[PDB]
Amino acid sequence: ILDYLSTERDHVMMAVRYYMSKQRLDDLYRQLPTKTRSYIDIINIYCDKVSNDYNRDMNIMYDMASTKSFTVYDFNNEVNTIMLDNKGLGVRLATISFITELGRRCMNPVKTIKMFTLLSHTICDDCFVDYITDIS
């Protein structure tokens, strides 16, 4: 992170980017209805716990993802494969937590948002939707 913040320009640029994105997220939330905010709370509660409980597991799995031959495209497909056979809530929550961790350590905002968008489709299968909708 501090390797990206070398000059004053890098700092100011980072500040502008953060403001734009933060403002967007703030305004997006204001527009969301009650139903969507509830789902956000549920994902927040459940994935925070998974992320904390399996924090060590998440870190070492990132080390595998930082491998040269690792690609989000191929990982997406393997995740899709796992969810077709495994219909438990856990694997879906764990994947979100892992993808979230990949996002935290990815400095390219474009590649990151691409990853979020793709994997969100893959993770939110009918089974996952049924789980989230059951809760509240």
Binding site: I82, G88, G90, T95
Partner: peptide
């Protein structure tokens, strides 16, 4: 190669969660 195995750990982790969540 690494993505296949990662997704299996997520499967493993998911099972731990499901059993305890019960």
């Amino acid at each position: 190669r690494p993505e296949i195995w990662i997704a299996q750990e997520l499967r493993r982790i998911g099972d731990e969660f499901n059993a305890y969540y019960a």
